[PDB]
Amino acid sequence: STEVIAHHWAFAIFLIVAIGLCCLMLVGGWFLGGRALRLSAKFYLVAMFFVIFDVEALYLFAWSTSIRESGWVGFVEAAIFIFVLLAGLVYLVRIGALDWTP
Amino acid sequence: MTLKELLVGFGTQVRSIWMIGLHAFAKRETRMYPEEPVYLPPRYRGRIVLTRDPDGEERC
Amino acid sequence: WISPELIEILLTILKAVVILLVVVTCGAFMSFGERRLLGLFQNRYGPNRVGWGGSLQLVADMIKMFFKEDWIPKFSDRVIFTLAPMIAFTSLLLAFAIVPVSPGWVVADLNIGILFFLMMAGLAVYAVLFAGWSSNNKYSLLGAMRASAQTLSYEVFLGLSLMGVVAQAGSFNMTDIVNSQAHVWNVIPQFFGFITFAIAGVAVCHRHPFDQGYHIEYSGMKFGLFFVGEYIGIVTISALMVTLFFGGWQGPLLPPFIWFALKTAFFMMMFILIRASLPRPRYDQVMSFGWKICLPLTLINLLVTAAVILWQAQ
Amino acid sequence: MEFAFYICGLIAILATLRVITHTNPVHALLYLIISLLAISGVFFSLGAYFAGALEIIVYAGAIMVLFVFVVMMLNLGGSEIEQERQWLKPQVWIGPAILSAIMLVVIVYAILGVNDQGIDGTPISAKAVGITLFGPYVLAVELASMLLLAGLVVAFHVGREE
Amino acid sequence: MIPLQHGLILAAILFVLGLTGLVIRRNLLFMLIGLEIMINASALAFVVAGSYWGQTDGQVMYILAISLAAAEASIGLALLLQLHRRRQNLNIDSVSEMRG
Amino acid sequence: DYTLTREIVTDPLNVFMGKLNDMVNWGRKNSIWPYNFGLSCCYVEMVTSFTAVHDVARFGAEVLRASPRQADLMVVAGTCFTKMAPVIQRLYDQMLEPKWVISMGACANSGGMYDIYSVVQGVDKFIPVDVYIPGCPPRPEAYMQALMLLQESIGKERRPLSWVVGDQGVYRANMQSERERKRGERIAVTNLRTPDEI
Ligand SMILES: CCCCCCCCCCCCCCCCCC(=O)OC[C@H](COP(=O)(O)OCCN)OC(=O)CCCCCCCCCCCCCCCCC
Ligand SMILES: CCCCCCCCCCCCCCCCCC(=O)OC[C@H](COP(=O)(O)OCCN)OC(=O)CCCCCCCCCCCCCCCCC
Ligand SMILES: CCCCCCCCCCCCCCCCCC(=O)OC[C@H](COP(=O)(O)OCCN)OC(=O)CCCCCCCCCCCCCCCCC
Ligand SMILES: CCCCCCCCCCCCCCCCCCCC
Ligand code: SF4
Numbered sequence: 001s002t003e004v005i006a007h008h009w010a011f012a013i014f015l016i017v018a019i020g021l022c023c024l025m026l027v028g029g030w031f032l033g034g035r036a037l038r039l040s041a042k043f044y045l046v047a048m049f050f051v052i053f054d055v056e057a058l059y060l061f062a063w064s065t066s067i068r069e070s071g072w073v074g075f076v077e078a079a080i081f082i083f084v085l086l087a088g089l090v091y092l093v094r095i096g097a098l099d100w101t102p
Numbered sequence: 103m104t105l106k107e108l109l110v111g112f113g114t115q116v117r118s119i120w121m122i123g124l125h126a127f128a129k130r131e132t133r134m135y136p137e138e139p140v141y142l143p144p145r146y147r148g149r150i151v152l153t154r155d156p157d158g159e160e161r162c
Numbered sequence: 163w164i165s166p167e168l169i170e171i172l173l174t175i176l177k178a179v180v181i182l183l184v185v186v187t188c189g190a191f192m193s194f195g196e197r198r199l200l201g202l203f204q205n206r207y208g209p210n211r212v213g214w215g216g217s218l219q220l221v222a223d224m225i226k227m228f229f230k231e232d233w234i235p236k237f238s239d240r241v242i243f244t245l246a247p248m249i250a251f252t253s254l255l256l257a258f259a260i261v262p263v264s265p266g267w268v269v270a271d272l273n274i275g276i277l278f279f280l281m282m283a284g285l286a287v288y289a290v291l292f293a294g295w296s297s298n299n300k301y302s303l304l305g306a307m308r309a310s311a312q313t314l315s316y317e318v319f320l321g322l323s324l325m326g327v328v329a330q331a332g333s334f335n336m337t338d339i340v341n342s343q344a345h346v347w348n349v350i351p352q353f354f355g356f357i358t359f360a361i362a363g364v365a366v367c368h369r370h371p372f373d374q375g376y377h378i379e380y381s382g383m384k385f386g387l388f389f390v391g392e393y394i395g396i397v398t399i400s401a402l403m404v405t406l407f408f409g410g411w412q413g414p415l416l417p418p419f420i421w422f423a424l425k426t427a428f429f430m431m432m433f434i435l436i437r438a439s440l441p442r443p444r445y446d447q448v449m450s451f452g453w454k455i456c457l458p459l460t461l462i463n464l465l466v467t468a469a470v471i472l473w474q475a476q
Numbered sequence: 477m478e479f480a481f482y483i484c485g486l487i488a489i490l491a492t493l494r495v496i497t498h499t500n501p502v503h504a505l506l507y508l509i510i511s512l513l514a515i516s517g518v519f520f521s522l523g524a525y526f527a528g529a530l531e532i533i534v535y536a537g538a539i540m541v542l543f544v545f546v547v548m549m550l551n552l553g554g555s556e557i558e559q560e561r562q563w564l565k566p567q568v569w570i571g572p573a574i575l576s577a578i579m580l581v582v583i584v585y586a587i588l589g590v591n592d593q594g595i596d597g598t599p600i601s602a603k604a605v606g607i608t609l610f611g612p613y614v615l616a617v618e619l620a621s622m623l624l625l626a627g628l629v630v631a632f633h634v635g636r637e638e
Numbered sequence: 639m640i641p642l643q644h645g646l647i648l649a650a651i652l653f654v655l656g657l658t659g660l661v662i663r664r665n666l667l668f669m670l671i672g673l674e675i676m677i678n679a680s681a682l683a684f685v686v687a688g689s690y691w692g693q694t695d696g697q698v699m700y701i702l703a704i705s706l707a708a709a710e711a712s713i714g715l716a717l718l719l720q721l722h723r724r725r726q727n728l729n730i731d732s733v734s735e736m737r738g
Numbered sequence: 739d740y741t742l743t744r745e746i747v748t749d750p751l752n753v754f755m756g757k758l759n760d761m762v763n764w765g766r767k768n769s770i771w772p773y774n775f776g777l778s779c780c781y782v783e784m785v786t787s788f789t790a791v792h793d794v795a796r797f798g799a800e801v802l803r804a805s806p807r808q809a810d811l812m813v814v815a816g817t818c819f820t821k822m823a824p825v826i827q828r829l830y831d832q833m834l835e836p837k838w839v840i841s842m843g844a845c846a847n848s849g850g851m852y853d854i855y856s857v858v859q860g861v862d863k864f865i866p867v868d869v870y871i872p873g874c875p876p877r878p879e880a881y882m883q884a885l886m887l888l889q890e891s892i893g894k895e896r897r898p899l900s901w902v903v904g905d906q907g908v909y910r911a912n913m914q915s916e917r918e919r920k921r922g923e924r925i926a927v928t929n930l931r932t933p934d935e936i
Contacts, residue, residue: 002166002167002170002171003170005171006167006170006171006173006174006175007174007268007270007271009171009174009175010174010175010177010178010269010270011178011259011269011270013175013178013179014178014179014181014182014256014259014269014270015256015259017178017179017182018182018252018255018256018259019252021182021186022247022248022251022252022387023248025228025383025387026244026247026248026383026384026387028228028383029227029228029230029232029382029383029384029386030232030383031900031901031902032228032229032899032900033228033229033230033231033232033382033835033898033899033900033901034231034835034897034898034900034901034906034908035231035835035901035906036231036835037300037303037304039304039307039548039549039551040637041549041635041636041637041719042637043307043311043545043549044542044545044546044549044635044715044716044719045632045635045636046311046314046315046449047311047314047541047542047545048542048628048631048632048635048712048715048716049318049453049628050314050315050317050318050538050541050542051534051538051539051541051542051708051711051712052624052625052627052628052708052709052712053318053457054317054318054533054534054537054538054708055534055538055624055704055705055708055709056621056624057318057319057321057322058530058533058534058701058704059609059617059620059621059701060322060325060461060464061277061321061325061328061602062526062602062605062606062609062610062701063606063609063610064325064328064329064464064468064606065328065329065332065333065334065602065603065606066603066604066606066607066610067329067332067468067471067472068332068471068472068475069603069607070606070607070610070611071472072472073610073614074610074611075468075469075472077610077614077617077618078465078468078610079465080618081617081618081621082461082464082465084618084621084622084625085461085621086458086461088625088628089453089454089457089458091629092628092632093453093454095632097632098449098450098453098454099446099450100445100446100449100450101446103450108455115439115440118439118440119435119436119439119440122203122435122438122439123203123435125203125204125205126202126203126205128205129205130205130206130207130790131205131206131790131791132205132206132207132790132791132792132793133791133792134207134793134796135792135879135882135883136879136882136883136886140877140879143936144930144931144932144933144934144935144936145933149924151924151927197795197800201790201793201795204790205790206789206790206793206795207793207795207796208793208795208796208800209795209796209797209798209800210796211796211797211798212768212769212798216796218768219768219769219798221765222764222765222766222768222769222798223765223769223798224765225761225762225764225765225766225769226765226766226769226810229762229765229766229899230810230834230835230836231834231835231836231901233807233834239500239502241503241506242502242506245506273525273599273601273602274525274529274602277529277533277602278529280529280533280537281529281532281533281537283537284532284533284534284536284537284538284541285532285536285537287537287541288509288541288544291541291544291545291548294548295502295544295548303548303551306548307545307548307549310541310545314541321533333603334602375804375805377805377808378804378805378807379805379807380807380808381805381807381808381834382834385807385808477639477640478639478640481640481644481645482644485644485645485648488648488652489648489651489652489655492652492655492656492659492675493655495659495671495675496655496656496658496659496662496663496668496672496675501667501668504668504671505671508671508674508675511652511675512678515652515678515682518645518648518682519682519685521640522640522645522685522686522689523689524685524688524689524696524697524700526697527681527685527696527697527700530700530701530704531704534704534708535678535704535707535708538708539674539707539708539711542711542712542715543667543670543671543674543711543715546667546715546718546719547667549719550719550722552667555727556727556729557664557665557728562664563662563663563664568662569658569662572658572661572662573658573662576654576655576657576658576661577654579654580650580651580654583650583654584647584650587643587646587647587650588643590642590643592641592642592643592690594639594640594641594642594690595639595640595641595642595645595686595689595690596639596692597639597640597689598692600688600689600692600693600694600697604694605694605697605698605701607694608694608695608698609694609698609701613698616698616702620701620702620705623705623706623709624705624708624709626709627708627709627710627712627713628709628712630713630716631712631713631715631716634713634716634717634719634720635715635716635719635720637723
């Protein structure tokens with residue numbers, strides 16, 4: 001189709017022009033003008049919780065686009081999925097894993 | 103935290119938004135220097151001068 | 163070279179270029195309008211002398227920031243320091259790249275859509291991380307750890323907040339999302355999704371009240387890149403919110419671009435009102451609200467949306 | 477279509493090659509992110525749109541973010557790593573590279589002797605992937621949630637500060 | 639029109655490159671990075687195999703693969719942080735207390 | 739008449755780079771971001787100028803960057819203490835070209851009333867100053883007038899457009915002093931309101 005190749009060209013032009021525009025303004029800023037603690041593990045815990053819940057979120061992303069086709073059985077399966085996820089979140093909250101200040 | 107505390111906090115945030123919007127719907131309090139000249143009281147302590155008598159000679 | 167296919171290709175390329183130029187000038191003029199609207203909220207005027215109504219203040223800022231002395235620290239990594247503003251600009255710019263502004267006026271009619279928005283936000287966190295590392299300052303390093311922890315703690319439910327609109331539309335396409343809002347806008351059924359997406363979009367843009375410094379070592383054009391990328395990102399989040407929860411371009415009387423621009427500008431004004439009104443919460447309550455409250459709210463909202471959809475499908 | 481696949485595959489190969497031979501951890505992770513973007517481009521050229529979407533959302537958006545988080549947490553200034561150059565001495569890397577090359581030729585000889593009509597590149601949408609995920613693969617989803625929970629519990633138990 | 643063999647060759651090249659990085663690097667962090675490269679190459683091979691046959695099985699197995707990869711990266715980084723906390727170095731050859 | 743810094747010279751200003759110089763000077767003078775540096779009571783009047791009753795935001799001088807890298811103008815508003823003088827000099831060195839200095843108040847001008855053992859007698863002893871404001875404290879509109887004076891000072895100075903092409907020295911105009919310019923109207927004042935009324 002003509003529309004799809006035109007849309008692909010438009011998206012390619014958008015990406016190229018945006019990247020080249022930011023590069024060109026960086027080059028212009030570089031060109032113009034004359035011259036003259038130990039981090040705790042709570043950050044790791046927060047990032048790891050983000051990673052795990054993001055993978056469970058990707059499973060929910062896959063489910064949400066096909067709710068009608070999956071029927072009530074898919075709703076039941078996602079209900080057990082979300083219940084397990086919420087049990088894990090409640091477990092994390094209740095043991096102080098998500099609490100910053102002790 | 104308590105759910106009542108969360109509801110009270112949401113209500114007071116909404117009140118803050120509404121009253122800031124009402125302040126936006128109010129009149130400006132800006133004196134526009136230098137287009138608007140600054141009113142100074144007669145005994146204001148600014149630039150120092152030397153003056154003259156009614157006869158016209160210097161008073162110092 | 164006279165052929166309708168080449169004419170259509172050139173027209174679509176020009177349409178995408180026009181959209182991009184309007185977006186970058188809208189972000190810069192929105193930085194100026196943020197200054198003006200903060201003046202309006204705080205019972206003052208703001209910049210109104212540089213040109214007619216202050217409209218040339220942005221040009222003065224751009225000329226100053228272009229002709230300022232470009233500085234890279236002596237004991238810093240040059241590639242990462244240069245690359246952080248690149249990410250802070252381009253990531254949320256190409257997050258805008260999927261937004262449909264009008265029927266027949268779109269850049270990319272992708273099958274992923276707000277999935278691509280999620281890819282772009284996950285790329286956008288690297289700007290804060292890289293700016294913190296490349297500064298060679300432990301204060302900016304700790305500030306970047308805190309800012310990146312906040313952005314991760316709210317990107318953990320950004321997509322799940324969008325999943326309600328995904329479920330009701332039945333597809334990831336933005337055109338299908340704005341077509342499914344032909345009768346009732348998504349703000350009414352997906353109200354919890356609407357507030358959670360508002361909070362997540364505020365937090366991932368490093369705006370009031372979810373912010374903080376990792377900006378101290380940048381100056382000149384790199385700081386201007388971070389600034390204009392932040393405002394372009396606010397435009398991006400506002401337009402995505404309009405196209406996801408308020409019907410996008412759909413309206414009774416006005417042309418579709420008029421309705422889309424009016425809703426987008428209203429959300430930008432609401433952003434400035436949020437910045438002017440709300441105070442700064444502390445870190446512990448911010449992360450506790452991000453994890454304990456908003457994420458289960460998005461999960462329960464997705465479950466209720468699925469139950470309502472399957473109940474309404476006879 | 478094939479142009480994007482070949483260019484992105486070459487970019488990913490070069491980026492991974494620069495990953496395994498680098499001393500700076502942040503530069504190695506940046507080249508790894510570039511390779512992940514290229515591999516997602518390969519995914520999008522093959523019609524697996526969900527694969528590329530989850531490659532940049534999760535693999536280049538969560539896992540690499542966690543790696544950069546750990547690297548900047550450790551403040552790795554290359555102590556006894558930047559000053560050693562041990563992997564660049566040929567007496568260290570000639571052996572394993574020869575072994576991996578031999579395995580690569582064996583796998584390539586195995587690959588070249590299979591029936592291949594080519595890939596049509598028809599876009600497999602995320603809708604069909606979600607249909608198969610919550611259809612014939614229900615137990616896979618539930619036990620994968622169980623596995624993610626187990627990994628979360630173990631990483632919490634190990635990575636505490638006290 | 640893209641051959642399946644070329645995608646499988648790309649996946650094999652990435653797999654042996656990640657394994658070479660896993661072997662020749664004495665750092666635990668670069669070992670974990672090479673492990674990440676290997677599991678990503680295996681997921682790439684599964685995606686190519688699934689897209690050749692026109693099935694969602696490849697993408698489903700990729701989803702399971704990246705779930706495992708995320709969990710394994712979390713586990714290895716937790717162990718790396720424990721090692722760096724209790725030994726102040728990431729030398730994988732120095733941690734050889736039991737042998738024979 | 740101009741002064742060099744790399745010497746009293748003349749005006750060196752085809753026509754294209756002249757318009758470029760005016761545009762660069764216009765962009766620099768219309769967008770000046772002061773550095774948030776709190777020293778003493780003069781900074782209290784500076785932030786009084788920053789509020790809504792005086793509207794320093796109209797001149798585009800309200801961003802108030804907390805880092806000296808992002809700031810173009812240092813407003814030394816307060817006493818130059820001996821302990822704080824290395825801090826002032828280090829913060830001035832952290833700023834990047836182009837940089838201008840406004841001394842606000844008699845303390846920053848000359849030490850003011852505090853000719854004492856622990857006060858440096860003026861910030862011009864160690865950093866160069868572009869604009870001086872008498873007062874203790876100067877009122878906020880006096881600070882805005884000094885900002886305008888700095889604006890017309892910048893508006894005719896000459897600086898290199900790029901670091902690779904042209905003369906890299908900086909030109910500063912030897913402006914006519916405000917005292918001799920305003921003497922024509924100041925001396926002609928004959929009567930003022932008596933101090934017994936409001
Ligand atoms: C500093 C620069 C760093 C590198 C930046 C990127 C470099 C490359 C720039 C040039 C790109 C040229 C254009 C590439 C093709 C664009 C069009 C495309 O991808 O089309 C394929 C597909 C079409 O989708 P659809 O229309 O729904 O299909 C139905 C029928 N075909 O659509 C899709 O599959 C869409 C999904 C893929 C879109 C990819 C967009 C770019 C991703 C990388 C962003 C990098 C951000 C900066 C760096 C971050 C930190 C490393
Ligand atoms: C396009 C996208 C953007 C759209 C723009 C428009 C929408 C903007 C949304 C902004 C959201 C801001 C959210 C701020 C959350 C702050 C949470 C927090 O940390 O609250 C802490 C505070 C105290 O908590 P506690 O632990 O009890 O501390 C007491 C200890 N002695 O807790 C409290 O005080 C309790 C209340 C917490 C906050 C509840 C939510 C308030 C949200 C702000 C008001 C929004 C009102 C509607 C605006 C218009 C919407 C169309
Ligand atoms: C040019 C020489 C090199 C210059 C420096 C490097 C620049 C970046 C090079 C890689 C990225 C761009 C590759 C070229 C893409 C051009 C567009 C294209 O080939 O589109 C084909 C196809 C469109 O979709 P489809 O429906 O399949 O179309 C079939 C046509 N009927 O497309 C698809 O199906 C998917 C297209 C690819 C996926 C989207 C883009 C991914 C970009 C990944 C960038 C990774 C980082 C690169 C960093 C480079 C610098 C270090
Ligand atoms: C904040 C708004 C950002 C908009 C970005 C895209 C701009 C595209 C401009 C399109 C102009 C034509 C729109 C279709 C024609 C019908 C409406 C005409 C009157 C506006
Ligand atoms: S000049 Fe006067 S008002 Fe200003 S810092 Fe000195 S004592 Fe304070």
